[PDB]
Every structure is written in structure tokens, then in C-alpha cells.
Amino acid sequence: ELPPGRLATTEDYFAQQAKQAVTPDVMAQLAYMNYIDFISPFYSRGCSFEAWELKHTPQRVIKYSIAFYAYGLASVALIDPKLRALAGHDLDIAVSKMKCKRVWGDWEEDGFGTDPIEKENIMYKGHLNLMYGLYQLVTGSRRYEAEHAHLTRIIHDEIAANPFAGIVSEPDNYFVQCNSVAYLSLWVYDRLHGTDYRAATRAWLDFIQKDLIDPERGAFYLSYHPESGAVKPWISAYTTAWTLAMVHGMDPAFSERYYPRFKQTFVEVYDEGRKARVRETAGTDDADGGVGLASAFTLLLAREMGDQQLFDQLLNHLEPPAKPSIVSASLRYEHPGSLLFDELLFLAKVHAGFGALLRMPPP
Amino acid sequence: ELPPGRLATTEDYFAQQAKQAVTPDVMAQLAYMNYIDFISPFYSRGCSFEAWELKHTPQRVIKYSIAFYAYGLASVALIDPKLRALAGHDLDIAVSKMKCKRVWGDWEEDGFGTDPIEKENIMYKGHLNLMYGLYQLVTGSRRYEAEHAHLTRIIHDEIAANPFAGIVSEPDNYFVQCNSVAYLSLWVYDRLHGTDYRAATRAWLDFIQKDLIDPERGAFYLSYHPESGAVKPWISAYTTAWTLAMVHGMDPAFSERYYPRFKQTFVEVYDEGRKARVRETAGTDDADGGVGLASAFTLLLAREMGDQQLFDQLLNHLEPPAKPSIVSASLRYEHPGSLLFDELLFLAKVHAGFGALLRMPPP
Amino acid sequence: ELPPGRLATTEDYFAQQAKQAVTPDVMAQLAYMNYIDFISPFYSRGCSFEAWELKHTPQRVIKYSIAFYAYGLASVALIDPKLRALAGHDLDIAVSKMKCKRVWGDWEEDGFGTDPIEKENIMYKGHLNLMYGLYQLVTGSRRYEAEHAHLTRIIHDEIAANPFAGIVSEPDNYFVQCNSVAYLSLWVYDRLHGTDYRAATRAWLDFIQKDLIDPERGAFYLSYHPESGAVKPWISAYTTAWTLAMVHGMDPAFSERYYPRFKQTFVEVYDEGRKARVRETAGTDDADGGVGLASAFTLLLAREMGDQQLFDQLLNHLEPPAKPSIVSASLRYEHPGSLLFDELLFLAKVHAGFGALLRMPPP
Amino acid sequence: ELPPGRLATTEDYFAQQAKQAVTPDVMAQLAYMNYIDFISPFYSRGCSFEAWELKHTPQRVIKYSIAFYAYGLASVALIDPKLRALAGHDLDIAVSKMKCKRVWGDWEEDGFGTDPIEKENIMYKGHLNLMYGLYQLVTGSRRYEAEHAHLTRIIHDEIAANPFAGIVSEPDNYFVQCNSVAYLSLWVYDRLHGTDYRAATRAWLDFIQKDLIDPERGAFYLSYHPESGAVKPWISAYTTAWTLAMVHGMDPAFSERYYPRFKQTFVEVYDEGRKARVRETAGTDDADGGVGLASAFTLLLAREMGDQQLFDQLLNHLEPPAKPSIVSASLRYEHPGSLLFDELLFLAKVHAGFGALLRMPPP
Amino acid sequence: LPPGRLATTEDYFAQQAKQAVTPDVMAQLAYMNYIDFISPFYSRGCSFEAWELKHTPQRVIKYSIAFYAYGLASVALIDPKLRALAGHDLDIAVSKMKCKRVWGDWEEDGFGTDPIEKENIMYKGHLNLMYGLYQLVTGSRRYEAEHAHLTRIIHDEIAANPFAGIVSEPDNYFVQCNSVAYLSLWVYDRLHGTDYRAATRAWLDFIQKDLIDPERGAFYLSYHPESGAVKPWISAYTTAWTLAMVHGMDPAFSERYYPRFKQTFVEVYDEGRKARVRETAGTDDADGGVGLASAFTLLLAREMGDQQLFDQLLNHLEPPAKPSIVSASLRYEHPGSLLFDELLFLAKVHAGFGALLRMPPP
């Protein structure tokens, strides 16, 4: 059956790639993304952010919104070849908008520098480098090749120069989740050019397993701070869910080791097995604390790991209270339950696996 | 009878040109446009937009407001010779205001360039080139002749240089409706100077019939993107209504072919044949989705095509809930149902046909 | 008797000059104008507009507020010699405040220039030139003589250089009412210096009788636009009332010709002959449309023309619903019915005739 | 007895100097003035006006607030020697704050000049010159001696240059009350240095008795305007009360002459002799019109003239409806009835007489 | 456990011995560190989102950051597993303290463009103590150059003044702000083996002559060197803060006045279960003025080892503030004063300013 308040079955979402068609509700999300002049997020390459003003997206989170849209569009390209030209066009726009000062300008306003790419700031330039790669996989266009080579060399050189494996975001803030994106961006560059930038990944997976994970609980600590050597002593569900999802595309064995322990630690099954919600940290019964993204990031992880049961449970918790409706063949939510809501449900519904995106066949 | 909340019969609007007089409610709209110091839209040539601030007109849509007023005024000049001097004065102001940075400045704010005319941006300069032509047909004034020749040569050269037939708006955004205006502006230049810029029209009508239209449904796709070759895979009522209305003035056979199919696809007759409302896309029962202009643009198409029944039905849907009143011989609407409301009802009530404007007798 | 909500009889207002005393309510208006530190309009020469902020006076209309106060004060000087020194002091302040950028700055904000006097802008500099003259008639002070000569020569030279008789306001906007003030300012300069700048008046009265008036209806068209020669094809009561009032001081025969026709066209007597209200244009029953000044400007015209009956009727319409009260010997209105309310009722109550102000005896 | 809503008896206020102690409520006012970090008026020398922002004090009136606090503090120094060091410290701050541009900057914003001291502006620099003097009488400090000599010489030279006796405020605005302060400041300089700047006072008292006072009513006209010779033809209670209070310190005979006539003209005793309120002008029954300070300035005059009965009557009108309370040994009013409320009640409660302040013994 | 309290007074006082913070202190550290962008200790940036959300007035941000820092230095001493974290938070505390949002009132008031060069001890005293506590906790020489520069400015300015200490605003002398400056010299001396603290004896002599009422054990509000004036009101928050800091330099001084301070200002109520603190004399009203007398006295009670008064004050302060833990993170629905979560944090963990001085190295 179709549980109440849902738009399509878990069977339907997982069958999209095989049926070579997106579900009607994913098509209605692409319509929200592309249809109305000026105010749709993928209307033009311009430095126009009307779509994010209307959703009340905080400035600091727009970079994550654009990136999550981009990762979803790369899966749409793989699902339906008739939509691959459209997905490529949207990715062109995603890259253009990602480079606008509205998106990266927090870096300058906080006093960290005038150039968002030259040093640090992996939370921005990791996502940008992955988007450059996914654009070229999807389209075969060399439009951003020069910028892509420049940013990839910056990421490689900065990893090589650091005593810890990886790159900080704000100075003296190290986040595994933001590093995972940077490392995946090196895999994609290597797939495009036959280079071996991804070689640095082994050292990184060794490093994050020493100080930054609780292996019994299958959960990463919130953050690391190289100057003091401090690890914030709380484990984080959203941090772990995101990291495991991306690492599965580079070292599947790593994510398969920790995933069942991650679920025991954080996932609460309820309503006689029909629903699930995710605790953000230990020592609490409360779901979706902190940034409120544990359930939505776990939905993406469930998709990456092929876990239909947990996917169905999480989507039954997340989607119905958001009261989705289709108006003029376009998807809207009356009560989005978190930041980045339509972005993450879109991405989770279409996600083909970061592994599959790496191996994407040419046009 | 006169249906309730309407100001004049469909017979009266269609009879204006023959009776050589505008209806009282059209005269009351011209009064709103011209009467009150400072706050009327056609008060002066200055870069003053108080009239648009009071209507809460979004910046990006002011260019369309001024242009629609201009197209209406050109029909007023043809209807009533006693109003032709007034119409000419308002068109002078329309051109002046259209050149103010408040109107075109989105082009610079989005990062596309400091000059709105030199390349691309046909959604602005197409309307501006048509207004230059209509000003000169109405008045016989050579005030803008030099600017008109310069912009016409830019449009001609840009068409000749493109591998696709026509000109983009934002870079890599191609809209048939905005191109239709550019092509009509070449017909008007040709009428004024005995040139053959309109020769490029055949190639354009061939091109938009290959990839950009669904001929069974008589409906254009939303947009085309030359870099990717992508066509947004949704059909658009407002896009089609506007395009067919303008093309009818250049190749009437083209619009006559698609019009009946356009009506089957999008038009919903309701209230026992008294009213009509227009769906914006396929796969929905919802009227006036998207930008919300399908009904109002179809009202203009009905006028262009001489379809009194559909004109009457659409106006019975649009005008009454907007609660029009005449106060001190000046027309206002308490609840305009869309953007550009008074502009499009004005234009639809007076529209003599784009063909007739081309053949306008001298003063 | 004294109708309800009125403060004094029409007989009393018309008798003030003969009794050599203003009525107590006019004295209470002078107190509003002069009494309270900082917030009274005539507190100081400074560029301080607290009095206009408290009345919510729109920026563009402050120049008209100051001017109307000034015209009233010139009549106060003529009515009561004991108040002539005070009236002169208020006129000093009126001239100073008129020259503040808060007052003329719209000229620069609209993009027309950085100097409000060098060319055009007669709606500002006409009023300023008349105020310079009235200040010197009232006081005998040579304080502004140099500025007065400079501005009078600018107005004279600009009239001489124009192919039409007079001067525009905004570029290509000609208003008879604003020109009437400029021409009267030349009569006043001539009275002060024995010059013949007023000679240009004959050509102006000839010109405004050809194209700008409807002689059967005794009413001026809204405006004239010299580039196109277009006349906005609506007649205006406030335009006509103001123009006839000022022209009566230069060519009384002209205003006497049109006044009875003006009243038939626009004035509605109601409440069994006790009240009157003025239509702003033709083809309406609605009173005080447009800027909403037709009744108040007609009150001043009735005073200028010596029409006690119409004066009484208009004041019975205007004053009572405004709910005037005297607090601490100072006049206030709870519900002013229009812009410039206290200014125009003040001016109409004291107005000695523009002819009489011209012939003002020395101090 | 102690009337209801009062904090201390008139007997207690008048006995403070003799008992060498301020009343508890005066001590609680000094606490409001000095206690809370940042937001108390006498917190620091800085250009910080948080205390005046919280009381919503209009910018133009801050100069008067600081000055009235200063005059009160000079009496506190005389009443209680244990508080004289504190009073001196507060006067140091009063002088510093008085010199901040927030306080004098209206002079520049109005266009009268960039220097508030060089010419005119006696409403500011009169108060500043008196404060320099009172600071030095109270403390013996030579901190401001150089500035004090410079400003005293400016005042002396400007009096000597004027054809009328005294100095204008805004150009062409002469106020007796603001002049009275300037003249008293010369008496204080003379007491400090054995000079004879006060010699100019005889000519000033002769001048203000000719044109500026109504001798029958014992009341000064609102203001004088030297360029026109105009006297605003209304008498002013607050103007007269302030002037007589200050003149009593220089020529007691002058104030004793007019005081009984001032009370007949303006003071209304009510509630069977228990209360009094003061009319601001003639030809009204309304109390505290205009700036609303007639009652509070008359309270200070009653104190200066030793009139316990009128002091008690006015304080019974002013204090109770203001709903005073002491919280944490600090005085507040829930409903202050006028501008400068706590400042003027403070000053009136402590005022030792301007004569006594002149004769202040050294520390 | 009284209702609306989160932990017993026994639990807070036992933290150092148990080498663990209580769960509610851990939940305060989580509020301080957990959520991206909006948590106060998220980054070194000149970003004040955390203080915008708490509606912290500009002039008081400097005190918020400093009180967090003093609490974190005690956390380092209580739980060695949290000492690296506390060091990281102190790094951020110092960075944020140097942002113009924090010190910029000095320039807006017209006193100067440099907040460190002269005067302004209410700012640079706290900053100099934070530089010291950062280096005690971490061993990091990151700020050593700035710390030496500011310490030498404070020493030279004390040496130049005819009164013992340094003004805040020009001609405003506050004992509480000076107490911090002097303690910052003790910490510099502990780090470098210098004798800047030598100036302390003259300072304790001076504040006992004119600035205290010894019968009432209470300091006057402020002193003004140009006039020699002492504002003639005694202040509870002024005294509580000063006695707490002086206890770390001259314990005998604070032990002399503490019992008299309590008689003068502290009101025990609700049958001995609660206490609240009068801000001045001649009033029955509690927590007048800046409203910090009760919260500063809670810190003093902790410094002086007075469990009974600590329990009484916390029973007055915490329950009406309606604390709750959501997702292992502490919030208060109705904070009863400025700097509420900052001062309850500091009072719950405070090991004594003496103990912080003697902090064992990394």
C-alpha cells in the first residue's frame, strides 16, 4: 500500500533507475526547481537569490542548498537520459550561483579573508570542487575545466602541507563531513583526467578512525581543532550520517563496518515499526536536536546503503507532517520540518549512490 | 445584458475602432495613467517610478508594465484620432522610462554586463526596439530614429551570428515569447524605412516549429538552452498565448493553425459557458499557475484572433473579482488578481491587432 | 447666525481689512504658526522641518505649504499694521526655509539637475521669486534684493528664449498654474524697481487662451507638453481655480470672463444652498478627485473674485468636518480633509486680492 | 501634614540648607543621576547619551536637561558639604557632556555654522558659560578656566557690538530668558576674577523693561526679532518665570516689582487653595500650553522668591499624577507630565537662590 | 533536590574531587559548543550570532566572554579529559574579545581608537586575565607577545598614577575592574617568574583607606581621581566581585570583610531555604541597579566555600529561570538578569581564583 501523507512508495523511488523514469513527485520537484520566471532556484546563471529569500534560507546554508540540489540532479541524469540535458543545464546554473558572493561572502564578513578558495574553507570549496566534477561527468562540457584543475590542485597541495589528514573550514575547525566531500571531489577529478589525487584517501580514512570516531558506537565526534588537539566530546548523528554516505562511494567496506552500530546508537524505530526518527547525540531521548538534520541526513545514508526498511520508516516520519501538495504540476510543502527540507528529500528520493555517480557513463 | 461587475460589453470593446471612440472605462484607464501629479505612471519623462512603487510592481516586471502600456497606447492612436496626440506623448514617456536604470538595471545587478543593449537581453531590448518603432508610427517624430537604427542593427547582426534562430535573454536562456517581440520590431522598422530585416522571420518560424512546439497540443515548451540543447519539458500557456498573438501579425496562418489546439489543451470553460480560465501547463486542473498570467495573456490572444466568445468568458473570470470602480472619471481595481493586471486588461480592451499597428496610417 | 463647526462669519473675514484687525481664529492660526519653540513652522530661519514632519506633509508639497503661508502673511501685513512687523519676520523665515534642500531637493533626486533655479522647475522658483517680492513689499528690507534680481532675470530670459510663452516645471511639462505665479512675480519686481518685466504677460495671456483653455467651459486643460505640442485632454478645477485667482491680479477682465463658466462646469451647490463642493474634472459627480484641492483652491478664487456666497458655501463644506479647536489660544484641526489644509483655509480667510498686495503701501 | 502622592513637606525642602542635609527623595534623585552603570546621566565624561535616549529627550532640549541638572548640583554643594565633592564631579561631567556634538549639533544641522560658540547661539553658550562658572565656584578647579575666559570675552564683545542689549539665539531670534543666563554667567565670572563684565546688566534691565515686557501684566512677550523690530505679540509664562528667577540673583528689586503681577496674570489656584497650575499665555483658561513648562518654571520661581505657599500648591499639582516611587534607594516617575520633569522638580527642591550660588563660600 | 534545581550543592562542590563536571554543567558546555554558527564558541570569527539571540547589550558582551573564560579555566582543573576542549574555547574567547563589536563602545564614546593604549581597565583587565588563563590551561604561546605588551602597559600605567590602579572611562575608578587587572599580574608572574604582582600591597592598602566602609564590609560604587570624590553609596555587586577576586591574592582581606558583607546585604528568607541580595543600603529591594548582586554573591559564596549561602542563592536564582535540557543542551526560559547563564555556569564550576593560579601545567 501507500502510507498516509506520502506521494509514492519506497519500491517506486528505488525502481526509478531500472524503469529509466523519475516518479511524478520528483518530476514536480524538478518543476518547482525550473518553472516560474525569476523566482525559481534554477531560472538563470545570475547572482539572483529570490528563490532562497522566499524559503527564508539563512545565508550560511545557501551553499549547502545549491550543493544538495546539484547531487540530486547528477542522479536524475543517471535515472532518465531524456532529462540528462536538463540536469546538465541545472548543474551549469548550480556552479554559477555557487560562485556568487551572496553564497561564499560569510568567509569575508567573519574576517577570514577576501578569497574563499585560496586557503581553508573546505565547507565551501569541497562542495564547489565536487560540483565542477559532477557538471563535467553529466555534460562532457570543458566550461569549468580550468577552474576545476586550479581548485583540485589547491585541495591536493593543502592536504600535503597539513600535519593532520585533510583541510579545516573556519581556521582551527576540522569537520569530517566537509572533508569527505573534498576527498570524493578528488575521486571525480581522477575519473575525468586519469590522475591519482585520490591516493591521499587511505591516510585520511586511517586518521579519522584514530581520534575522530567512537568505533563501538559507529559515530564521529562533532569536530576536531588542530591548534589544541581538542575533539569536542559529543558524538553527532548528522555528522556521521553524511560522512558514512560519502565514504561508501570511496571505501564501501568502511561504511558497512560502522552503519549497523550507527543505527543502534542513534535510530529510534516507533509506531509498531512503521516510522523512525534519529537522535542527534548521546545522553538524550530527543530526536533531531542541534541543527535538526539527523533524520534527513540518515534518509540519504539509508538510500546510499540500500536500506529500504529504514528509508521507508524515516520518510514516514519526515514527509506527512510537512503536508506536501502538487499545484500546477509543481511540488510545495506547507510545513517543512527543518532547513534544507525540499533539497534533502529530493536528493534522498533520487540518490543513485556516490559510487554510481563516479562511474557515470558518458553522454 | 451586461454581466455583473463588468464595465462594458465585448461588442463595445470590439466596436471601438469602427466607432472611432474608446469606451468610457478605457478613457478612465487613460485618466489613471495621466491625471494625478507625481504618482501617475505617465506624469513625466523622468526616472521617477512612484506609480510602480504604489502598485508594488516587482523591479524585474516594470519593463513589461511600460511595454504593455505602450502597445495599448499604439492601438488607442489608431482607434481615436482625437487621442492620437495624447497616445504619442505617453509613448515618448514610455520610451524615456524604459531607458532608466531602475528598469534595465537587473542586467547589471545579476552580473551579466553594464550595457543592457550590446548583447543578449532580448527580453528587455526586444520590447524597447518595438516601442521605438510604435512611437515613430504614432507621432512621425524622428526623436529616437538614431537609437532605433542602432538597436535594430544589433538585433539583426546577433540573429545572423547565432546557430539557432533568434537571441537569448539571460545568457543560455532562449524564450520564444521574447524573440517574437524582437522579430515584430524588425517588421515595424521595415515599414518605416523600406528595409528587409523581416526576411529572417521565415528561418525563425521554421526553427520554433522543429524543437520548441508540441504541434498536436498547439503549445510551446517553457524555454530552450543552446549550450546544453535542453528544452524544459513542460508546455506553457502564457508563453504560447503571447507568442501566437505576436506571430499572428507576421504570419497569421501560423497562429490560425495552432490556436484551436491551444484552446483544447489549456482553456477551461465553466459556469454554464459564461466564464473561462486558463491552465498554465499540462497534468493539472489548476488555473493560472506559474507566473499567473495564462488567463490575461489568453485574453489578449482572443482579441488578436477575433474570438469574441472566449474574450467575453475570460473577462467575466478576470474583471469582476478585481472589483473595478471609476472615481472622478479615473479607473482603479480594489483586488487585482495578478501582476500587470491593469496593463493587460487595458491592452486587451483596445488591441487593434499587431498587423493593424504595422499598417498604421500616418498622422 | 454662525453655522455649526465654523469659527467666524463670512462677513467677519471680508470685514478684517476695513476693521484693521484679524479675527480671533486667524490670530490663533498665527499662534500655531509662531508660538511653540522648535516645532512651530515659523520658529527659525534654519533647515528644520519638525512642523511639517508632525503634519505628515509629503516632501514634494512642502514648497507649496511655505508659499501659501507666505501669501497669507502678505495679506495679514495689509489687514493689521500692528502685525506687519511680525508678518515680515515670518516672510524672512518663509524665504530662508524655501531655499533649504529638504524643500527643492526632489529636483536633484528625480535626476533633473543639482541647481533648482538655473533652468526649468518653475513650480519651485516661481513661488520663490514671488516670495522674495512679497518679503520686500511688506518689510522694505533689501536682504534678498541681489538673489531676487538674479532669479527675476533668469525667469525673464527663459521666457524670452522659449518658443512657447512661459517656462516648464519638469522637462517637457508645462502647467498654467505654476506659470501664473512666475508672471505675478514679475509684476511684484516691477512695482519694487520701476522695471517692465511684466510686459511679457500679454503674450502669455494670448497663448493660454489659444490652446490651453476650453472657453465655453471656462476651464484649463491639465497640462501642455511643448516637444509634442500635446495637451492632456482633461480639464482641471484646481488648475483653473489657482490660475484665475492669480491672473485676476494682472488682468482682472480675463478672470471675470471665465469665472461664471468655471462655476457652472465644476461647482456643485448642495444642502439647500448652505454648502458647495467642487468636481476636479468633467464626466463625474465625485467632488475633490485627483490631488483633492479643487474645493480649497476655489475657496481662494471666491475670495479673490469677492464672491461671499460661494466662499461661505465652500467653507461650510471644508471646515466643520475638519473639527477645528482652539487650545492655549492656538488653532488645530483634528481631521484635515486634504493636503495643505490649514495653509489654504488661512490664505482664503485673510486674502486681500493679488491686486491689493501689488499696490501694498510702504511701511 | 504631607499631602497624598508627595514625598516630603515644603517645610523639609526649604529647611535642607539649615539642616545641612538633602531630603531622602533628593538623595534618591542623586542616586538615579549617578548609580547605574552606562545608563545613568552622570556615569562618565563621554559622548554617551543613553540616559536621554531612555527618557526620549528630544535632541534640542538635552542642552537644557544638562544645564538644569548642573544648577541643582550647585545648590546641593551649598546644602551638604559631605556631597560637595560629588556635586563637583557631576558638574565636571555636565560641562564635558554639554560640549558633545549630540548636544550643540542642531546649530550645524540647521545651517547656522560649524562652531557653536563664535557668534549668536546664546541659548547654548549662555548655559555653558554659567556651568563653567558654577563648576569653578563648587570645586576651585582651574580645569576649564581658559575656555571660561574665552567664552566670557565672546559674550562681552558681542553685547558691546549689538544695538539692542544682549545676544540672539538663532540669527534674528532674541529670547530674554536665554539672555538672563548669559548675564548671570558674567556675575559668576566677576565673582571668580574680580572683573566688571556684569556692568552691562544695567543697560540690559533698562532695555527689557522698554519694549519686551507688558508692565500691567508683569509678563514678557515671547520673543524679539531685531532685523524687523517685531515683538511676537503674546505674553509667555515660562519665558517670564525663568527670566524673573535668574534676574532675582542680579537685581532682586526687579523681580520683586513684577512677581505679584506675574502671579495674577498666569497662576490659577484651585482645589480650595491646595493646588495651582500656570497658564502659558493670555486669552485662555488652559494650563501648561505651548512647551508645557509654565507650572514647572513657576515652581522654580516660587523657590527663588521664597514663596512657600505657591511652591506647595504647584508641587501638589505636578508631583502626585507623575506617580513617583523609590526603588533600591533611587527615584523614578511612572508618568512625567512634561519635558525636563525630573530635572526641574530636582532643581526646584534644592534651589538655594542664584544670589546664594554667587556668594558660595570656597571649599 | 529542591524543585526547579538540576543538581545538589554537594554535587557542584564535589566536581573537582570526583574529576567530573555534573550533567547540567556538561549540558551548558554543549549549549556553548554544539550547534553550527549560532553557538558562542563555534569559531574565532567576529561573528556574534549567539549574543544577538540572547539580546546581550553591546556594552556587556566583554563581561559575557570573560565570565565564560573564567568558568572554562575551572572546567580545565575539574576534568582533565575536558582540558583540551576548555583550551579551545579559551582560544575563541580571546579572539572574540579582540573584535570591534566587543571593545568598540570605547571609540563610539569618543575616548580613543585604540582600546588598550591607556585607561579602559574594564576591558583590558579582563582581556589580560584571559590571555593568562589561556596559556595556563593550554601551554600555547599563541598570544604571548600581546600578553607581554598588555601586561607592561598595565604595570607602567599603575606606576604613573598617584592613586593605586587604573581608571576605566577617564576619571572613573572601579575597584572591581582593578581587582581583575591585579589578578592578571599574578597570572603573568606565575607564567614567567616576574614580580608585577608586587604592586598589589599598595593597592590593597589604598582601597581600604577611602573606597571601603569597613564596619559594613562594603565598597563605595566608584572613585573619581580629578575631584577625589567617592560616590557615597555602597554596592553589593561591586563588593561581591572584588572580594571574590581579592581572595585569590590576599585571602585574609576577603575573610575579614565577608561576614560583614553578608550582614549588610544578604536577606535569608523562606525559612532558611533561599537568599537574595540588596544592591545598596537604605532599601529592602533585592537586585536593584544592574541586577547582579545575587549572581555575583553566588560566585563569592563559591570562592569563600560557603555551601549554605550558595544553596540559598541558587534556590532563589535557578527555579524561576525555568531551566530545561533538550538534546543534552541547557536552556533557561526566563533568565532573571543580564549574564545569567554565564554567571550560573561560572558559580557552579568555580575552583577558586587561588586554585587557577596554582593550575598544574600541561
UniProtKB/Swiss-Prot annotation, chains A, B, C, D:
The active site is at D37 (proton donor/acceptor). The keyword Cell wall biogenesis/degradation does not apply. Keywords: Disulfide bond, Isomerase, Lyase, Periplasm, Signal. One of its GO terms (biological process) is monoterpenoid metabolic process. Induction: By monoterpenes such as limonene, myrcene and alpha-phellandrene, but not by acetate. The keyword Cytoplasm does not apply. Optimum pH is 9.0 for the linalool dehydratase activity. Is inhibited by molecular oxygen, high salt concentrations (NaCl, KCl, or MgCl(2)), urea, and Ti(III)citrate. Activity is not affected by EDTA. Pathway: Terpene metabolism; monoterpene degradation. Changing C178 to A/S: Loss of activity. GO terms for molecular function: hydro-lyase activity; intramolecular hydroxytransferase activity. Optimum temperature is 35 degrees Celsius for the linalool dehydratase activity. It is found in: Periplasm. Its EC number is 4.2.1.127, 5.4.4.4. Requires DTT as a reducing agent for full activity in vitro. This is Linalool dehydratase/isomerase. It comes from Castellaniella defragrans (strain DSM 12143 / CCUG 39792 / 65Phen) (Alcaligenes defragrans).
